[PDB]
Design an enzyme around this catalytic site. Structure first.
Site, PDB file in Angstrom:
ATOM      1  N   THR B   1       0.826  -1.201   0.000  1.00 53.97           N
ATOM      2  CA  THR B   1       0.000   0.000   0.000  1.00 53.97           C
ATOM      3  C   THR B   1       0.864   1.257   0.000  1.00 53.97           C
ATOM      4  OG1 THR B   1      -1.692   1.258   1.211  1.00 53.97           O
ATOM      5  CG2 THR B   1      -0.161  -0.076   2.511  1.00 53.97           C
ATOM      6  N   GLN B   2       0.232   2.411   0.208  1.00 54.45           N
ATOM      7  CA  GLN B   2       0.955   3.676   0.235  1.00 54.45           C
ATOM      8  C   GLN B   2       1.458   4.044   1.624  1.00 54.45           C
ATOM      9  OE1 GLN B   2       2.087   5.643  -2.031  1.00 54.45           O
ATOM     10  NE2 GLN B   2       1.135   4.776  -3.871  1.00 54.45           N
TER      11      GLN B   2
END
Lengths: 52, 223, 191, 205, 188, 254, 142, 210, 212, 205
Positions: B1-2
């Site tokens: 993910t970020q």
């Protein structure tokens, strides 16, 4: 480097095996087997002069 | 993910003369909010491996699922899964490092830091670290996050080098780990008072301790 | 990269400057900014390096294939329409690249010369005269153009335009390759 | 706030009760995630019975507190003991006239013979509100409903102490910027009293 | 006419110092003296000239008032204060070398652009690259060298730096003793 | 139907080893990665690979930076019976010791030569690939490949990756029986020029002027070699190559 | 179990990735003439500056089909997805209509789109190729 | 935007003798101003008397070494357990590096071994694949502190050809000790692999960090 | 007058055109100890292997700084001059509170543009004092403080072995151990240890290279 | 969160009591400062005795809920009534596998004859947690401490109703995006019960 004569012969035979299942598991490539016989003459440092 | 959303803080591990000791606190923080209490961040794999994961909680649960799938597939179709055909810590760490590097190369990494600890079949201690970039390394003492900056010197004071490993008993290592966890609870805002400990010894096997609290708190030097 | 095309009563004159590359010194006698689409249809192009030559060679190959297949020569109008369609298709799914094309031909069925210009977006316009490159010369063409001019008058006008362009250019403007398309085909003027 | 500047992520609670006022806070100073100081005295004494707690920029709040203490010393040299309203007015004027360059918020707890203890709050921007009780800081957002449900007028001393202890314990529990010990100052007619509570005490409530 | 940038090396030998600066050949030297104190400035040429003029001014006033030449330590402190004066508009890399007229001990020091003093007991390198030359100086340096040995060492370091990146490269070397200063040119 | 059943039967997904390319590139099922005539280049699986590469290629270990061939002066001209290719052997400082001179010229075949004038790795890799392609073509057709064909192959290859990040400019020089001696310039932007005189590098205007002063078709081998050496010296250890129909011959300074 | 398609980007590229259109003189390079794309379209330009929704729309029904197959495998077993895929593959492989592109009725019945219309149905959308023989070669693999 | 790269420091050095090769590296793995490990080898025996070391991003170097070892294993399987030469290995590594041209490895690579004649051979590789054969090469953030030391204490034109293995080991140890004194990153250990016709020998020395 | 702003626009124009430690303080039952490492690095390169980071404001008031070295030195020297003048004017021993006030006001005047983070220890007739000062003008009071890049390891060591009632020898040992841990576990810290011990009624004891 | 979407800023609660579970929520849907819909039924049902409340993006949560209801219908056709754990697992998988494209958070309440009522929470990201009670939404942050001070195991139905009513009333009071009426669903062995409480009833608490 130069390829060994036996290595090239093995590669050609693996190609000839393509009317069924290939050596590495590839699917069939041709409907019928080849109708050719080959005499392969070479020279390499490992095994001198070779005929297959 | 970020970026991680629910996160764990630190896992600390040490080698002693007969095995390994690992520890991590039970907390999932939602930003600056200490949201979830009672999150087990130590995963016992096999009868001799413990994996400590710090970071995104969802990715930690995904890795737990992967470890369970690996354990289930190991018994397929080995009738000696409990026997000599069990999973060594080296196998598990190699698989996890491969997964982490493959996901890093795919631009979708697992935002975690993983420490694998255990004892091999021949009795050799195993202790390795991998992260979201796939960087792997080994050391007689390992830690993640704020543990890598505060608990690491405390642990290295005990096991300074490879020659000091046979000289360290289990009691000394456990005491050092408890003290390091107390220091982390002192000086980490995202830390928690409750933590879990795991001891892997080539003679006594696996000992998992839960609901351990930081004690002997010194706060009287105020007024 | 400056290209000019002048249509006179009986022929079309196409002039192209020598192609140069930044920081590279080249000495050659060739026309690499012009492809002969057909014995009576010539094409000149100017734009970004690489893409323009690939597009020109693709067009030339397609037109040669049509000529071989049909044993016949396409009209300049059909050639220009095909070039416009292919140019519009080239930038269908990519960033457009700078390209300007002048197509000059002599229609045998109509027995008359024709000239077309296509820009980078694929806008085909039939013109009496056209130019691309430096952006000066349209006034000179406008004041000295007649639909019934002969080949010699067109060549004189082209010489005047070349001299005017050379004067403003900082003496780095080399010679101009000039070709004439008429009923006898395509020829090159060494004057 | 400015880049690299220390921010006061505290938990502040001032409560007025039948015999005066009590002002309590935690003792944690953070640097994002690292605890710079485990024990801090956030209870600032501006006058003998006029105390305050600060939020926002640390430097600006310290400068404002020093200037207000100097102003109150000057006032005392002339007219004797000031009132909580005067100190709140000075704080409000300093904060509002400088809000374009300084980030500061104050909670003032005072006692005097006329007014019998009062609480004022000056949030960011420079507006003064007089309230029976006030809560501020990062953790204060987690105890709005609890404080609203469990507040009464003219409580006893022990009831107010317990209320502040419970509310600050919850704020410390749910907030990562709140620290170990709880410091409270009780301002009454008898005098100034200081109380301290340790985590092993209030975590078992 | 670009003359911005350069390399200045200062070394201490047994009872002497050596200060050397790069040239450009194809009249602008980067080493200045105010008695028995030498200063080498690297960086912007205008700032070098401004610092030279300002330090000449201040040293002349110091000599007129104190009635004695300024010592290298006092000059180092003066340079540090002058550099810190322009805190928000700072100028360069200065290097100070000399021998105290009373104690006789050699002294070398370096400065940043806001006058932070780094006093080195072995050597100081100032310049843009400061990586190849620094390594060559570190490999070639030996403590307590004679003036001839120190000159040979510093000249070899400069020549090695010049070889690894010209037609118009030169160097100026000062070998400073308590009673004599020798100035030499190197033409590679 | 068996393959369909196996597809819906249950670790490999996380390893990404259910894909053929991943297994081939990691040398799991065999050495088929080193058997591809057309190599496969890894691209980031993101919406902006080009911007990613450009941003990450300008950021700071000197050893971990993409090596760039130095802009040294390179010259080439065809006079009457061959091609003279002249380069300057002026090495650059570095943290290494060379066992031989820097190979600023790539030997494609015993009959073809090329110049770097760009990125070192790109030039070496793609000119070795071009040599392999020319060898395969010569085996198939039983005749030496024309220089135009080799230049066109290289131009098409570098055009297929136009804008991706490649940076190379080469001069393919070759002497064939049908065409004579020919020089082409192939750029990474797809440019392909044919010329009689080529000068490139940091300084080439002076060399081109020297050539234009004393260039003619009716030269000789010694005269052409001297002219090339003089041009390289004036543009400033001058390596020379003379290409004839029988191949190329190297001269250190003669 | 995906709702929005994922992993739509290429991981590797080569000059012979398009196996159908390859040159015969140089088998390692593509055949620009038979591509019939414009003549100035390098493959690298396809890796940058694409509409973000193009990948989502291009592979959307496939993602829903895969999620449905995964649900069937989770709830029903291997046999149900195996049979669905087998039927769909048989239907797709039997059909060969070089003169049309519209799908068969049985394919829509299996896909449960007998009375469903999307913009793909409304909008179903040379010198070389696009003839019967090219499609025959592509279908038969010769 | 996720950043896939990193840096772990470290210094490596490769020297070629007349009948031997030497490849050494400091055994310290460090993140930014922190010590991950005081002993993490970066030089490996990659098969037939070939030593390989990739310095920089640790994950990329490990991946490249793993891929090369698997390629060597398949090479032995394919051709009758034929011994892989140093130049063939260099070309294999060049192809492995260039296969990631648009997503490059963030490493600098050095390999060492013996050529066909029997002399020592050292090859150096930039991150994208370009390689060349060199007598001596230093990589990492200490090369500017190691190369001048070697150039001062030896000549590559005492000629390098007449040096023995012990003298080369002593020079490497002295240069790395000097770098450890001058550079913060270098220290905590030095591992040296020596390749001769008898095989590969490993030696370890403790630097000034314990 | 004062610090100049000349050539600020010129410096910005040039910049737009491409033209370009472990400290601890421990308070013990009758005084305060301040310790520091002795390595000065210009980035990766170790510029000096023995540097004195313990600066003196008053004979019995010492400090150690971090951030911008020039700013730290200049501010310490200015505050020392002010403290000496104040002591001469009042004919009394200077107090650590006065130095704290002067430092705080000077740092707040420049609104954080003077980068100097300090640990200030001292002993005056009112007792022993230890303060930490931030570059923006905020000061804090503590019993044990750490500063620098190696401050985390030092803080861990201090938290491990700190008690209310410590003797002089125990405090010296604790400070030395904290600096040693910072030296070993941090790349920016190294070399020797400098210590300064200040008791009540006794001269300050300054030990350079206490542990080599 | 994509620009221009609708955010489910609400006050979600789920409490497990002796005889089952109760799921409560408010009825306010706002777009900025404007209340787009002041009567909203946020108690989404995915099975006869399995309910959920959604937060994040309305579209993504609705799509996930529809897919989960489809999955549970298939399961019921095959094996019968699913447990709350299975529904929570499906929710977690759907939220986790699409966390790079969809922003969704779920609170799942359920009942069955074996487990006797359970509560699960899937926050943003996709992790799953099983708790005796759960709170979520923008307005939850104000009742945390309150919810930690008034929850008891094995409460009766009336006690749980009062607890949820008080907590949601406080959350509505202190949150700008929480308001309207309180909707509660009681899941026990007897069946499903619906309760609605109007502002004039809970605002007097």
């Amino acid at each position: 480097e130069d390829i060994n004569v036996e290595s090239l012969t093995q590669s050609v035979c693996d190609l000839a095996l393509r009317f069924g299942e290939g050596a590495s598991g590839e699917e069939r490539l041709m409907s019928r087997p080849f109708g050719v016989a080959l005499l392969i003459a070479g020279h390499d440092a490992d095994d001198g002069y070779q005929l297959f | 993910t970020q970026q991680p959303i629910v996160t764990g803080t630190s896992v600390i591990s040490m080698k002693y003369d007969n095995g390994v000791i690992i520890a991590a606190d039970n907390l999932g923080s939602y930003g600056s909010l200490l949201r979830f209490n009672g999150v087990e961040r130590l995963i016992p794999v096999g009868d001799n491996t413990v994996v400590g994961i710090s970071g995104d909680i969802s990715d930690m649960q995904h890795i737990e699922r992967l470890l369970k799938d690996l354990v289930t597939e190991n018994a397929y179709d080995n009738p000696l899964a409990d026997a000599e055909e069990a999973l060594e810590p080296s196998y598990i760490f190699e698989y996890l490092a491969t997964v982490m590097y493959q996901r890093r190369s795919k631009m979708n990494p697992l935002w975690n830091a993983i420490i694998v600890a255990g004892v091999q079949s021949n009795g050799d201690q195993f202790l390795r670290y991998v992260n979201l970039l796939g960087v792997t390394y080994s050391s007689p003492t390992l830690a993640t996050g704020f543990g890598a900056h505060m608990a690491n010197p405390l642990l290295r004071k005990v096991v300074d080098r490879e020659s000091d490993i046979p000289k360290t008993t289990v009691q000394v290592a456990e005491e050092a780990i408890v003290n390091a966890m107390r220091v982390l609870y002192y000086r980490d805002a995202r830390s928690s008072r409750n933590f879990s400990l795991a001891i892997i010894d080539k003679n006594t096997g696996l000992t998992f301790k839960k609901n351990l609290q930081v004690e002997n708190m010194k706060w009287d030097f105020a007024k | 990269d400056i290209i000019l095309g002048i249509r006179v009563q009986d022929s079309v004159i196409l002039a192209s400057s020598k192609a140069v590359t930044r920081g590279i010194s080249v000495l050659k006698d060739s026309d690499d900014k012009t492809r002969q689409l057909s014995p009576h249809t010539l094409m000149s192009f100017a734009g970004e390096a690489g893409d323009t030559v690939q597009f020109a060679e693709y067009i030339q190959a397609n037109i040669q294939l049509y000529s071989i297949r049909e044993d016949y020569e396409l009209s300049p109008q059909a050639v220009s329409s095909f070039v416009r369609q292919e140019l519009a298709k080239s930038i269908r799914s990519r960033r457009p690249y700078q390209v300007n094309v002048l197509i000059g031909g002599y229609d045998k069925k109509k027995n008359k010369p024709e000239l077309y210009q296509i820009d980078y977006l694929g806008t085909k316009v039939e013109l009496p005269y056209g130019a691309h490159g430096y952006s000066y010369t349209f006034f000179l063409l406008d004041h000295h153009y007649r639909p019934d001019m002969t080949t010699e008058e067109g060549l004189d006008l082209l010489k005047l335009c070349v001299q005017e362009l050379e004067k403003r250019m900082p003496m780095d403007f080399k010679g101009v390759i000039v070709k004439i398309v008429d009923k006898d085909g395509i020829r090159q003027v060494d004057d | 706030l400015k880049k690299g500047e220390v921010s006061l992520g505290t938990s502040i609670m001032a409560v007025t009760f039948k015999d005066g006022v009590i002002l309590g806070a935690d003792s944690r100073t953070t640097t994002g995630a690292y605890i710079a100081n485990r024990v801090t005295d956030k209870l600032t004494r501006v006058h003998d019975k006029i105390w305050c707690c600060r939020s926002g920029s640390a430097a600006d709040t310290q400068a404002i507190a020093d200037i207000v203490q100097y102003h109150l010393e000057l006032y005392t040299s002339q007219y004797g003991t000031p009132s909580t309203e005067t100190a709140a007015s000075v704080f409000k004027e300093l904060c509002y006239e400088n809000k374009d360059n300084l980030t500061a918020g104050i909670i003032v707890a005072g006692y005097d013979d006329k007014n019998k203890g009062e609480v004022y709050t000056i949030p960011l921007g420079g507006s003064v509100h007089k309230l029976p009780y006030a809560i501020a800081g990062s953790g204060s957002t987690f105890i709005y409903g609890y404080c609203d449900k469990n507040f009464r007028e003219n409580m006893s001393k022990e009831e107010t102490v317990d209320f502040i202890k419970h509310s600050l314990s919850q704020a410390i529990k749910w907030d990562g910027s709140s620290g170990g010990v709880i410091r409270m100052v009780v301002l009454t007619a008898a005098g100034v009293e200081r109380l301290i509570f340790y985590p092993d005490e209030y975590e078992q409530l | 006419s670009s003359i911005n940038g350069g390399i200045v090396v200062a070394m201490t030998g047994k009872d002497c110092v050596a200060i050397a600066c790069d040239l450009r050949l194809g009249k602008f030297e980067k080493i200045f003296h105010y008695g028995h104190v030498f200063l080498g400035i690297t960086g912007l040429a205008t700032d070098v000239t401004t610092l030279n003029e300002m330090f000449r001014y201040k040293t002349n006033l110091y000599k007129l008032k104190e009635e004695r030449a300024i010592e290298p330590e006092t000059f180092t402190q003066l340079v540090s204060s002058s550099l810190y004066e322009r805190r928000f508009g700072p100028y360069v890399g200065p290097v100070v070398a000399g021998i105290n007229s009373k104690s006789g001990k050699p002294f070398i020091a370096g400065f940043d652009l806001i006058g932070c003093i780094d006093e080195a007991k072995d050597f100081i390198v100032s310049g843009t690259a400061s990586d190849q030359l620094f390594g060559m100086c570190e490999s070639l340096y030996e403590p307590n060298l004679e003036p001839e040995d120190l000159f040979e060492t510093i000249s070899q370091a400069l020549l090695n730096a010049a070889d690894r990146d010209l037609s118009g490269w030169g160097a100026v070397v000062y070998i400073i003793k308590k009673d004599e200063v020798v100035k030499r040119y190197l033409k590679m | 139907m068996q393959a369909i059943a196996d597809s819906f039967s249950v670790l490999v997904k996380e390893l990404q080893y259910d894909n053929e390319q991943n297994l081939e590139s990691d040398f799991v099922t065999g050495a088929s990665q080193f058997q591809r005539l057309a190599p496969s280049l890894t691209v980031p699986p993101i919406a902006s690979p080009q911007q990613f590469l450009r941003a990450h290629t300008d950021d700071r270990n000197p050893d971990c930076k993409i090596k760039i061939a130095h802009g040294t002066t390179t010259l080439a001209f065809r006079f009457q019976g061959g091609i003279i290719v002249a380069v300057d052997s002026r090495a650059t400082a570095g943290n290494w010791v060379a066992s031989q001179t820097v190979k600023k010229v790539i030997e494609i075949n015993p009959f073809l030569l090329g110049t770097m004038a760009g990125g070192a790795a790109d030039c070496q890799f793609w000119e070795t690939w071009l040599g392999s392609q020319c060898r395969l073509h010569e085996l198939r057709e039983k005749e030496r490949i024309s220089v135009a064909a080799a230049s066109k192959i290289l131009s098409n290859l570098v055009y297929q990756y136009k804008g991706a990040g490649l940076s190379m400019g080469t001069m393919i020089c070759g002497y064939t029986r049908k065409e004579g001696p020919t020089i082409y310039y192939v750029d990474s932007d797809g440019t392909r020029l044919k010329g009689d005189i080529f000068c490139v590098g940091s300084g080439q205007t002076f060399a081109y002027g020297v050539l234009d002063s004393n260039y003619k078709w009716d030269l000789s081998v010694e005269d052409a070699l001297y002219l090339g050496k003089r041009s390289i010296l004036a543009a400033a250890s001058v390596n020379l190559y003379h290409v004839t129909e029988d191949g190329w011959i190297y001269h250190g300074n003669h | 179990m995906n709702i929005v398609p994922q992993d739509t980007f290429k991981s590797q590229v080569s000059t012979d990735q398009d196996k159908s259109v390859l040159s015969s003189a140089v088998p390692s390079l593509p055949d620009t003439l038979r591509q019939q794309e414009g003549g100035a379209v390098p493959l690298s330009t396809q890796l940058n500056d694409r509409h973000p929704l193009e990948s989502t729309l291009k592979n959307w029904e496939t993602t829903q089909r895969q999620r449905q197959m995964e649900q069937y495998r989770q709830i029903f077993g291997i046999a149900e997805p195996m049979k669905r895929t087998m039927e769909m593959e048989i239907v797709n492989r039997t059909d060969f209509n070089p003169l049309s592109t519209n799908g068969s009725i049985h394919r829509d019945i299996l896909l449960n789109k007998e009375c469903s219309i999307d913009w793909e149905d409304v909008y179903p959308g040379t010198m070389v190729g696009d003839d019967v023989h090219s499609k025959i070669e592509k279908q038969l693999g010769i | 935007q996720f950043n896939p790269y990193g840096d772990n420091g470290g210094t490596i050095l490769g020297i070629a003798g007349e009948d031997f090769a030497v490849l050494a590296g400091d055994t310290r793995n460090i993140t930014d101003y922190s010590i991950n490990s005081r002993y993490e080898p970066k030089v490996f025996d990659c098969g037939d008397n070939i030593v390989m070391s990739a310095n920089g991003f640790a994950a990329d170097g490990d991946a490249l070494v793993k891929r090369f070892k698997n390629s060597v294993k398949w090479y032995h399987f394919d051709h009758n357990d034929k011994k892989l030469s140093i130049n063939s290995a260099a070309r294999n590594i060049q192809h492995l590096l260039y296969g990631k041209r648009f997503f490059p490895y963030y490493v600098h690579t050095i390999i060492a071994g013996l050529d066909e004649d029997g002399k020592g051979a050292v090859y150096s590789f930039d991150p994208v694949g370009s390689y060349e054969r060199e007598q001596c090469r230093a990589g990492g953030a200490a090369a500017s502190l190691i190369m001048p030391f070697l150039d001062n204490q030896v000549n590559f034109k005492k000629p390098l050809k007449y040096l023995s293995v012990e003298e080369v080991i002593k020079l490497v140890r002295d240069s790395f000790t000097s770098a450890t004194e001058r550079h913060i990153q270098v220290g905590d250990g030095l591992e040296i692999l020596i390749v001769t016709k008898d095989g590969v020998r490993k030696e370890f020395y403790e630097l000034k960090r314990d | 007058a004062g610090l100049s702003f000349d050539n600020y626009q010129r410096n910005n124009f040039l910049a737009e055109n491409s033209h370009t430690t472990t400290i601890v303080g421990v308070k013990f039952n009758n005084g305060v100890v301040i310790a520091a490492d002795t390595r000065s690095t210009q980035g990766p390169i170790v510029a000096d292997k023995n540097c004195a980071k313990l600066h003196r404001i008053s004979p019995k008031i010492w400090c150690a700084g971090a951030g911008t070295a020039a700013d730290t030195e200049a501010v310490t020297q200015l505050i020392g001059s002010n403290i000496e003048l104040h002591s001469l004017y009042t004919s009394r021993e200077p107090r650590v509170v006065s130095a704290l006030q002067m430092l705080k006001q000077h740092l707040f005047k420049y609104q954080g543009h003077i980068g100097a983070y300090l640990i200030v220890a001292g002993v005056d007739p009112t007792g022993s004092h230890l303060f930490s000062i931030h570059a923006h003008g905020s000061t804090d009071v503590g019993y044990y403080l750490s500063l620098g890049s190696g401050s985390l390891a030092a803080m861990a060591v201090l938290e491990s072995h700190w008690k209310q009632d410590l003797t002089k020898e125990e405090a010296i040992k604790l400070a030395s151990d904290a600096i040693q841990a910072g030296i070993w576990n941090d790349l920016g810290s190294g070399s020797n240890v400098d210590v300064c011990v200040m008791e009540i009624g006794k001269d300050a004891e300054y030990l350079r290279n206490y542990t080599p």
